[PDB]
Structure formats: C-alpha cells, structure tokens
C-alpha cells in the first residue's frame, strides 16, 4: 500500500543511485532481468506478470553518466522514458542549471513524475540525491524543489546531499554553489541530510583497512545508510519509524532541519571474527567523533534530538540500558529544554551484504541521524571561503553571463549569515 518516489539529480545522484538500486535488488532477491524467481511493493511496481520496475527518475544534462547505466548490467531494469538526458552540461555552475538550461528539461520530467506519482496510491514522501558543489545538483535541484511545492506542498521530501570539504575538495568554484543552493533548501526542503567525502575517506582508511578507496566504496557505504532510513517501511519489526514520524521527532524548528548521519559497525571480514559486536559498543560507535559523516566536532556540539534505527538481532531490554548509559555520560550532552531526546526504532531483518563487498556480514547495525549545534560551525568557514572569493569579484563574470543579477549574491550571503546565529540563539 505504502509508496515512495526516488529522484536522482546530477552525476553524483546518478552514481550514488545505481549502488542503492543494486542493494535493493539484492535485498528482495531480484536479478537484473527484473523477474523474481509483498515487502518490495514500495520501490518496485510489478508490471503485468514478473517485471519489477523501480520508482525512479534520473536527470542529467550530459549523456555520459546516464548512458553508463543503459549499456551495463542494469540495461534491463530501466527504460528510456525513465532516463532523461540533456545536451549542454551544467559545467560546474549554478546559473547554467537554474536559469538558462533548466527551463527545457524540467518540463519533460514533471509530466513523467506525475505519471509515476499518480500510479502509486500511498505516497509517503520524496527522496532527492545530489551535491551542493555540483552544477546540475545545485541549479536544477533548486528549480525542481521550487516546482514541487506547487503540486504537493505538505507531502514530505528528503535529500541526501554531498557537502563540500574545507581541505579535500575537487572543484574551485564550489563555495559559490553551496551558498546559492541553500536559499531554496530552507524554504522548500523538509529535512536534508549531509555527508562529506573527506569524513568518509578517513572511515574507509581506518576501519575497513583499504588504503586505496574510490567512489564505488563510498557509494556502497551511502546505500546502506539510505536503506537504514527506509528499512522501517519495507519490513515489520516490533517497533516502527515511518518518515512522517521521523520528521515529527527529529526536526524541532522551522529554520533548523539539517541533521547529520552516522553508521556502525563498518569493519573488515577478518576483523569481524575477533571483534565481539555488542549493542552497547555499537551505540558508542555512533557517538564517537571518528565515525561521523561530516567534518564536525561533537565535543563542541550539543544534540537537540537524534533518532536511532536498529536492524538485525535486537530486543528492547538492553536497548533501554544503552540509552540510559549515554544519558548518564557527560561527554555527550543535550540542550536544557529537551529532557528526553531519543527516538528508537527496531527491525528483525538483518542488513544485507553485496557480492564482493568491503563491509563484513554482521548481525546488528545502527544509524543515528542527529540534529545538533556541531554542524552550525561547519558553515562559518564556508562563509569565510566564499567571502574571500567574492571580495575581489573572482569567477563572477561567468555567472553574470548566464543571467545572474548581482543582488542575488548579496541575498544568499546575508541570509546564510543570519542563519548561523539562529543555532546560537537556540543553544543559549
């Protein structure tokens, strides 16, 4: 009965999405052909007799990344109506994606979305994968987001965004991109989750013991996290956490809706034999500064709310104990106005593992999405970066050429600045 629509924007979204799809397929016992040799009804619709098509829309302005899917193993899973393709790319620019190029493609996709959305009956909410630093992932997303409030509004939305790093970042004009695209995110998006590549890289190195990671290792990691959000829908545990419920729980104010994720345990195949995975230990792992998905400092931060989601062999008896222990500790700390700050989910289904996967096959797993003042400090340096770039009008002429007025920049920076103080106000 329940249903949810996935959207994938830009190259990053596409790249991430494939892995997720694969994971999903693995979960429900479906080969690339789309015929299974119920629970899966949410993401897959059964066409006629034994053809499982995904709830998906891949947008891209190049053909390269989309044609990668059309020629590979998952050629049979999708059809050309689902896979939309542009001509001229975003070219790592917000202005190209939103104003000039964005008019033509969005129109095509909205109809498609409607066709997909009206087919399903129980719309829970949307998922939108992209990157803030990316061209298509910023300019188009903003447009798209704006559009989606007209047709739906109250129907929920989520987005798992690749946040830019201060040290290890693979593009020069990223600062600009972030600042602009966050203007639409505050008004339209209900709750956006944030991940940083640098953070991931460290995790990959230290715990998995693979000193040569590429994007395919990160994508897999991300997919697990994604699953851990939607695992409550597709399987019937003793206690359940729907998306609306989650939203109600984690997000306190209209301005703040930027929690950060974390995932544990993540360890090698050889390390699983020695390491006795206890519940308490895994709980601890979520609160460690080393295992966070964003470059942040939990020591400075304070958790307003955070939603735990267990899957595998778990029961409430020791969960309670775990909860209590954390509360007792003073290294972890909360804001004065929130005495009780957790939302706890359980699931019987164990988390699956991919053929030739870096992660070990485990009984238990955890995913904590914490709203905090730790991520408030992350944009203070972003702003600084941005400001310097702007101060001498660097890279501005390109933007101007694409139809961006000069006041737009003023609007987006000031707003950002204003927002930074909000966290402070809340946490006083």
């Amino acid at each position: 009965m329940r249903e949810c629509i996935s959207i994938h924007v830009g190259q990053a979204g596409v790249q991430i999405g494939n892995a997720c799809w694969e994971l999903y397929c693995l979960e429900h016992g479906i080969q690339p052909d789309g015929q299974m040799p119920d629970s899966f009804n949410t993401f897959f619709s059964e066409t006629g007799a034994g053809k499982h098509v995904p709830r998906a829309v891949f947008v891209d302005l190049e053909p390269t990344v989309i044609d990668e899917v059309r020629t590979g193993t998952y050629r049979q899973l999708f059809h050309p109506e689902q896979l939309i393709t542009g001509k001229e790319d975003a070219a790592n620019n917000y202005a190209r994606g939103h104003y000039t190029i964005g008019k033509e493609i969005i129109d095509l996709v909205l109809d498609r979305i409607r066709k997909l959305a009206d087919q399903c009956t129980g719309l829970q909410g949307f998922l939108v994968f992209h990157s803030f630093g990316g061209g298509t992932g910023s300019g188009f997303t903003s447009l798209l987001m704006e559009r989606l409030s007209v047709d739906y509004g109250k129907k929920s939305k989520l987005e798992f965004s690749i946040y830019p790093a201060p040290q290890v970042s693979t593009a020069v004009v990223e600062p600009y991109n972030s600042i602009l695209t966050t203007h639409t995110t505050l008004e339209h998006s209900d709750c956006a989750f944030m991940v940083d590549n640098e953070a991931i890289y460290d995790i990959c190195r230290r715990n998995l013991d693979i000193e040569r990671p590429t994007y395919t290792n990160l994508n897999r990691l991300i997919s697990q996290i994604v699953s851990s959000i939607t695992a409550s829908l597709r399987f019937d545990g003793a206690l359940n956490v729907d998306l609306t419920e989650f939203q109600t729980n984690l997000v306190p104010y209209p301005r703040i809706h930027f929690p950060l994720a974390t995932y544990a345990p993540v360890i090698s195949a050889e390390k699983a034999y020695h390491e006795q995975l206890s519940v308490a230990e895994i709980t601890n792992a979520c609160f460690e500064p080393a295992n966070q998905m964003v470059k942040c400092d939990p020591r400075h931060g304070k958790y307003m709310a955070c939603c735990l989601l267990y899957r595998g062999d778990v029961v409430p008896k020791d969960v309670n104990a775990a909860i209590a222990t954390i509360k007792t500790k003073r290294s972890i700390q909360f804001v004065d106005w929130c005495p009780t700050g957790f939302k706890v989910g359980i699931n019987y289904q164990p988390p699956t593992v991919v053929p030739g996967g870096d992660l070990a096959k485990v009984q238990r797993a955890v995913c904590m999405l914490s709203n905090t003042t730790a991520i408030a400090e992350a944009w203070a340096r972003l702003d600084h970066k941005f400001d310097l770039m702007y101060a001498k009008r660097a890279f501005v002429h390109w933007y101007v050429g694409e139809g961006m007025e000069e006041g737009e920049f003023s609007e987006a920076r000031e707003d950002m600045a204003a927002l930074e103080k909000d966290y402070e106000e809340v946490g006083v």
């Binding site: 419920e245 109600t248 104010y253 709310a305 309670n320 009780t340 700050g341 706890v344």
Partner: protein, 426 residues
C-alpha cells in the same frame, strides 16, 4: 445478558488485544476456526458476554480494531486466532498520524471515526443489554491517543448511562520512545479526566523490572509484556464470565474505588509471578499471595507507592479459598501499614472471589489500587512539558493543524488542577 464490546487502537494497544483475545479464548476453550472443544460446562454459561454465537456453532469476538495505517493489521491476521475475528470489524486508514496528537485528534482521526461510529452501533444493537465498553490504546504517540480520545467523548452523547474503561500506557522517563511524549500526554490526558469512569495507568519501565528480577527471564520481548498486561484485563472481568462465592462486577468496583469525581486513575498489579526456579520452592498460599501483592517493586506503575496513602484498595481472587484466610490477611496488612492508608476513610479493603481459576495455575490475585503516589508519574511529565514549552520547541507540527498556544495552557492548567487533587487529601 450483560455484554461488553471491546475497542482497540494504536500499535501497542492492538498488539495487546491480539494476545488478550487469545488468552480469553484459551480460558473458555475456543479454537482458530471458532468451534468449541472444551469440557467444563460453565465456560459455555456466560459465553455471551465476550462472544456472539454465530451460525454453525462458530463463536466470534465482539471487537473493533482501529488504526491510521494498514501495517499493524497484517501480523494480526497471520498470527494465532487471527481467523476468529470478523472481517467486517477491522477499520484502517491510509494516512497515519506520525506521532502527533494534533494530527490524530482533529484532521486524520475525524475522517476515520465516522466508519467506527456506525460499526459500534450495530454491535450495540446486537447484544441484549450492553453494560460498558473496554478500550485499549497508548498516550505516547498520536495514533492511539488522538483517535481513541476523539472516539470516547462521542460515546458519552449516545450512551451517557454506561460504564467506561480505558487501559492506557503512559510514558516513562528512562525508557523514552519518542521525543514529544510530554506534549502528547499533556493534551491526551485532558479529555480522559471528565469523560472516563476508570483508567489503568501501566508503564513499561516497571514491567521490565518485574521481568528481570521476579521471572528471571534472560531474553525478554514485547510478547512477554503483552502476555502480562492481558492477564490483568482477564482478572478484572472474571466475575462476569464465571460464577463465584462472592461476585464483583465492573460497576460495583467503580462504585467502591472511585470516591470523588476527578480522582479515578488506578494502578494495576498481578500475582503470583514465579520463575522456573521459584515455581517449585514458593509455597502458594493466601498469606504468601497477599504479602507479595503489596510490595512497591511488584507494581505495574513505575512509582514509589509508599510516599503516600492508598485512598481505596480492591482485589479479585481466583480459585477456591477459605474466606477467614482471605479476609483476615487484608486486615492484618492494614494493621501493619497504618501510616500507608487514609485514616478518614476507615476500612479501605474490597475483596472478590471466583471459583474458576486461570489453565495451569491454582490461584491468582489482581490488585487495583488508588493512591496519592500517582503525583510522581504526572509531576515529571509536567516538568518535561514546562521544559519543552518554555522555548516553543516542536511547536510548528502542532500549530500547523490549527492549535493556539493558549490551547496548550488550557489543558496544562487542567492537568495541574488534577495533580493538585491528590495533594489536597495526602
């Protein structure tokens, strides 16, 4: 004669019902198809109170199952004695509350209730003389709270002269499921003050305690809890369903244990509770049963009962017992604990005895108490609410459904007043 239709709501309440119903069937001897296989003849003379005799000797449960999502109704059908339930009586929506009482009570629940308000009528018509409705739900979330609350007040318009029971599950400070418990609780309690006749406040924190120490169970689950809770329900309505030397129905109990209009919240308790080890060595006799019953740690409400006095006290014993043994023990207890019973209501005790015991156990005791120690349960909640409401946190979800900030303080005030009523007579 004298029928009681059962209502259910919420994820937990439904689960409880699922087990409760099973237990009741076991007690009478009903099978998954519905055909009777029992031997003892007295199970069939009061079968009518909880089972309509349908065509072909197949009995059916007089029940209403409500939810704002279809998820929980899947596992109820596939489990044991899911086939006994009638397909007509299941009611469910496609939306869901999302742990919000504002959404549950006004927008989402009021669209679903009009189906149930028609379904219950039919049930009422069916029986000869309905005496009351049992209701099972939670106050923690929005689904079981908002819907049930909405329902229970509209029953008082059609049926003002009937007794009203409510089996709730209030939030704990340590085992906190959701973040917005204080809010939901604060608003959900308001309507349960004036509309209900009696309410049993259960808490999971106490249940866990009961499980770990007394039953010595290595791996507890929610199933165990459900089993426990259901037992209490079975206990209260034993006198209707079976004959006895001294019978005590619901109305009588209500009259005895509710002295004042606004002070009717009770705390359940159950005995004997024995592990595999304590099954052999514990001498199950009346005195033993008694002493265990009045222990602070044996209660289902996570409080300290010995901070204040019991306003009233009642018990429902099962199996054949000598009355001089039974009636003396209570007296003795009273004598002992002269500082833990109200002085200006002398003789606080109420007793009831049934001849048909639970299958396996020789004897049983269901403890329903009314105390001034319920202040500790509410006080904490109030404090939490204050902490939350000071900064207007988590408010835009509630204000989005058309609720003013005054409307919180209206209920809050009421709650405070209610709390005070215990500290008036302590």
């Amino acid at each position: 004669m004298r029928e009681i239709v059962h209502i259910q709501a919420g994820q937990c309440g439904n689960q409880i019902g699922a087990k409760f119903w099973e237990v009741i069937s076991d007690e009478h001897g009903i099978d998954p198809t519905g055909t009777y296989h029992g031997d003892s003849d007295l199970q069939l003379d009061r079968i009518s109170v909880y089972y309509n005799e349908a065509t072909g000797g197949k009995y059916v449960p007089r029940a209403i199952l409500v939810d704002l999502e279809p998820g929980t109704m899947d596992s109820v059908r596939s489990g044991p004695f899911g086939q006994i339930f009638r397909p007509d009586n299941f009611v469910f929506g496609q939306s869901g509350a999302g742990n919000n009482w504002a959404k549950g009570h006004y927008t989402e629940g009021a669209e679903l209730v009009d189906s149930v308000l028609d379904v219950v009528r039919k049930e009422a018509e069916s029986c000869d003389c309905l005496q009351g409705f049992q209701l099972t739900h939670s106050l923690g979330g929005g689904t079981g709270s908002g819907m049930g609350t909405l329902l229970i007040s509209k029953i008082r318009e059609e049926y003002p002269d009937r007794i009203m029971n409510t089996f709730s599950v209030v939030p704990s400070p340590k085992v906190s499921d959701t973040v917005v418990e204080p809010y939901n609780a604060t608003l959900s309690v308001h309507q349960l003050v004036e509309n209900t006749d009696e309410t049993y406040c259960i808490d999971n924190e106490a249940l866990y305690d009961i499980c770990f120490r007394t039953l010595k169970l290595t791996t507890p689950t929610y199933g165990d809890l459900n089993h426990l809770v259901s037992a209490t329900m079975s206990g209260v309505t034993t006198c209707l369903r079976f004959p006895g030397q001294l019978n005590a129905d619901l109305r009588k109990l209500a009259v005895n244990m509710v002295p004042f209009p606004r002070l009717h919240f009770f705390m359940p308790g159950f005995a004997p509770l024995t592990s595999r080890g304590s099954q052999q060595y514990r001498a199950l006799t009346v005195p033993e049963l008694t002493q265990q019953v009045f222990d602070a740690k044996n209660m289902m409400a996570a409080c300290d009962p010995r901070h204040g006095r019991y306003l009233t006290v009642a018990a429902v014993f099962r199996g054949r017992m000598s009355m001089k043994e039974v009636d003396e023990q209570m007296l003795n207890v009273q004598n002992k604990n002269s500082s833990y019973f109200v002085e200006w209501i002398p003789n606080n005790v109420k007793t009831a005895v049934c001849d048909i015991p639970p299958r396996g156990l020789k004897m049983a005791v269901t403890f329903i108490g009314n105390s001034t120690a319920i202040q500790e349960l509410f006080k904490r909640i109030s404090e939490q609410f204050t902490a939350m409401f000071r900064r207007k946190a988590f408010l835009h979800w509630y204000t989005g459904e058309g609720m003013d900030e005054m409307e919180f303080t209206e209920a809050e005030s009421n709650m405070n007043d209610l709390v005070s009523e215990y500290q008036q007579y302590q």
